[PDB]
Scaffold this active site. Sequence first.
Site, short mmCIF file in Angstrom:
data_model
loop_
_atom_site.label_atom_id
_atom_site.label_comp_id
_atom_site.label_asym_id
_atom_site.label_seq_id
_atom_site.Cartn_x
_atom_site.Cartn_y
_atom_site.Cartn_z
N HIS A 1 -25.32 1.72 -53.77
CA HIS A 1 -25.84 2.28 -52.52
C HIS A 1 -25.68 3.80 -52.44
O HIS A 1 -26.15 4.39 -51.47
CB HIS A 1 -25.31 1.57 -51.27
CG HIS A 1 -23.90 1.88 -50.92
ND1 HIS A 1 -22.89 0.99 -51.18
CD2 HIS A 1 -23.37 2.97 -50.33
CE1 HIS A 1 -21.78 1.55 -50.73
NE2 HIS A 1 -22.02 2.74 -50.21
N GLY B 1 -17.18 8.12 -46.72
CA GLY B 1 -16.89 8.86 -47.93
C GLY B 1 -15.96 8.13 -48.88
O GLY B 1 -15.82 8.55 -50.03
N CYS C 1 -16.26 5.02 -50.07
CA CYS C 1 -16.89 4.07 -50.99
C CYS C 1 -16.72 4.48 -52.41
O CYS C 1 -16.65 5.65 -52.69
CB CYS C 1 -18.36 3.84 -50.64
SG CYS C 1 -18.59 3.05 -49.03
C1 LIG Z 1 -19.95 4.11 -48.37
O1 LIG Z 1 -20.90 4.66 -49.27
C2 LIG Z 1 -19.29 5.25 -47.62
O2 LIG Z 1 -18.46 6.01 -48.10
N1 LIG Z 1 -19.76 5.28 -46.35
C3 LIG Z 1 -20.62 4.24 -46.11
C4 LIG Z 1 -21.30 3.88 -44.93
C5 LIG Z 1 -21.20 4.65 -43.66
O3 LIG Z 1 -20.71 5.75 -43.56
O4 LIG Z 1 -21.76 3.99 -42.64
C6 LIG Z 1 -22.17 4.80 -41.50
C7 LIG Z 1 -23.54 4.33 -41.10
C8 LIG Z 1 -24.37 3.72 -42.03
C9 LIG Z 1 -25.60 3.20 -41.65
C10 LIG Z 1 -26.00 3.29 -40.33
C11 LIG Z 1 -25.20 3.90 -39.37
C12 LIG Z 1 -25.60 3.92 -37.92
C13 LIG Z 1 -23.98 4.43 -39.78
C14 LIG Z 1 -22.10 2.74 -44.94
C15 LIG Z 1 -22.21 1.96 -46.08
C16 LIG Z 1 -21.53 2.31 -47.24
C17 LIG Z 1 -20.75 3.46 -47.26
#
Ligand SMILES: *[C@]1(O)C(=O)Nc2c(C(=O)OCc3cccc(C)c3)cccc21
Lengths: 304, 304
Positions: free
Chosen positions: B41, B143, B145
């Site tokens: 992702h 961050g 992940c």
């Molecule tokens: C990992 O890749 C990571 O480090 N962060 C992350 C997120 C994340 O920050 O979610 C916030 C988000 C995502 C999609 C929609 C909204 C409203 C907020 C998510 C998935 C994987 C990872």
Amino acid sequence: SGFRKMAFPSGKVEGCMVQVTCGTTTLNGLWLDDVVYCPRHVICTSEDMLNPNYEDLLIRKSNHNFLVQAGNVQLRVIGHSMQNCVLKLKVDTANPKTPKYKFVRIQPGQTFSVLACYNGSPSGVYQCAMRPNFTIKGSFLNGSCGSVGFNIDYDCVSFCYMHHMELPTGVHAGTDLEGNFYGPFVDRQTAQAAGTDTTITVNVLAWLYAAVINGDRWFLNRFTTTLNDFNLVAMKYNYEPLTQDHVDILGPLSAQTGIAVLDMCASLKELLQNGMNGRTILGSALLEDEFTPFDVVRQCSGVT
Amino acid sequence: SGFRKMAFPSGKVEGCMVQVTCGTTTLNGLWLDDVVYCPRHVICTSEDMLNPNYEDLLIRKSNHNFLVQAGNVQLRVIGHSMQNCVLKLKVDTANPKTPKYKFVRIQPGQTFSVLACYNGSPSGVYQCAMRPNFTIKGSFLNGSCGSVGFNIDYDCVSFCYMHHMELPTGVHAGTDLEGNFYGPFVDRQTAQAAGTDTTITVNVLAWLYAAVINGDRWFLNRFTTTLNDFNLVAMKYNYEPLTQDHVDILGPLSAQTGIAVLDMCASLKELLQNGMNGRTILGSALLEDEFTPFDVVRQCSGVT
Ligand SMILES: *[C@]1(O)C(=O)Nc2c(C(=O)OCc3cccc(C)c3)cccc21
Ligand SMILES: *[C@]1(O)C(=O)Nc2c(C(=O)OCc3cccc(C)c3)cccc21
């Protein structure tokens, strides 16, 4: 989200651990630049520990009696001195893995990570706090002496503890990196009882703020209190008195959550008076006091 | 003595963490030999995460779209492939700090350490367990992940987890290092609810043995039970069923303490039925289940 008891990454400290042997006593040493720091009781036999005269025992020791091994290689000892309860063994080779470092003497309530070692080899890392009675509740078996406690600020390691003793009650005592014990403890196998292990109030409040930030809000009540009223209840529960300095340090957590410090104090007061009623906060059934306000901010913000 | 929630020393894993950026998405990668492993992702925008077609999104990506940075230097990506939910980015430089390693898929109830990272930089280390519902209760912010879970056997790192997701309930989901999720979770921002978070019975028994070894013996009762009788009570308390394999694995702790496994089961049964009555075991007011029998032996013996 999620809140865990977290230690600093230990790599920078793993690169400093050495084994120190004097006669038949082996323990751990910390190799920073061309100096190896270790508990002075490396010169004692188990018999000597009952009433050791360190200066006298040291007269019978020379540079060649201290055997320092880094990995599978021997370091040459070219000098040795006693500073309080630690020996400093000057070696002919500067540790190539010496990180940026400082020696700090922490205050009670402050947390730090310990890298438990045996024969100069790291076995594990855990998070501790200097208790208000100057003991630490660690995990230390025979051979773990000389393991150190530290905090990290980006790339600088602040060494704050070196392990020396286990008191008859199973709690631990040690020194800063200048060899001064925390509290009134001595490196002698004698009757040393610890004082009251009170709860670090400012840490419990910081951890209640972490719980709110992570969704655990059931304990938030409809009350407020004053520092004086709170402290009367805190004294009754063997909690450390809360000062205006503690309130100031909690200011950023108060700002982020919108919960005034004295409101969280009133919530804590009701938790002390009513108990948890079988409920948990951040997966704990007791109030956790081994997270400082800075640890909560760091973990809730992602400081690397 | 003393018993602590302890993580493995993290140095060997700190030397493998890199930052991986694809477009405007940045996360962590694991650099072992000439391959960088990271969650697939990294190719998604927050918008793509709602219903991503990874194969389709990957068609628009080339070797030069994946930016890998180790410290402050850039690694050259010479190949990229998707294996289940991870990307493997072949780089032109083998990681000079690659430790001896294996990729293992752990079973529920097994514990491991996590090195939480942000932008390829380690922030902390903590001990986790794969829950019986295949989630982990970690501490992961945006961050984090690509941060990994691992166990160490002397000098060999067995990587068992890579962080990918946070479920709507705040618990975490991820994969082994072949990209297969633990449990039924997917790398999509959709309704994924976890099953029952049952207690890891064999771990609770192992931790009760650690308590006995360290002096906490108040809970030892005058009773015994059978696996069938115990399991009827365990089902009622959302505890995992105990098997003869679990009894066998506890054998060394039973031998060291002289307390038969089924006697400890009867003590656990009374703790479940009567509660702790405001008392603590190893400084906890609830029964700890994130220590395996092997972790208890290792910590109570000093494995390095
Ligand atoms: C990992 O890749 C990571 O480090 N962060 C992350 C997120 C994340 O920050 O979610 C916030 C988000 C995502 C999609 C929609 C909204 C409203 C907020 C998510 C998935 C994987 C990872
Ligand atoms: C540290 O140097 C260390 O690693 N072990 C240790 C001990 C210790 O093992 O105590 C056992 C002991 C000592 C004296 C008398 C008896 C009966 C048993 C002690 C002090 C410091 C250290």
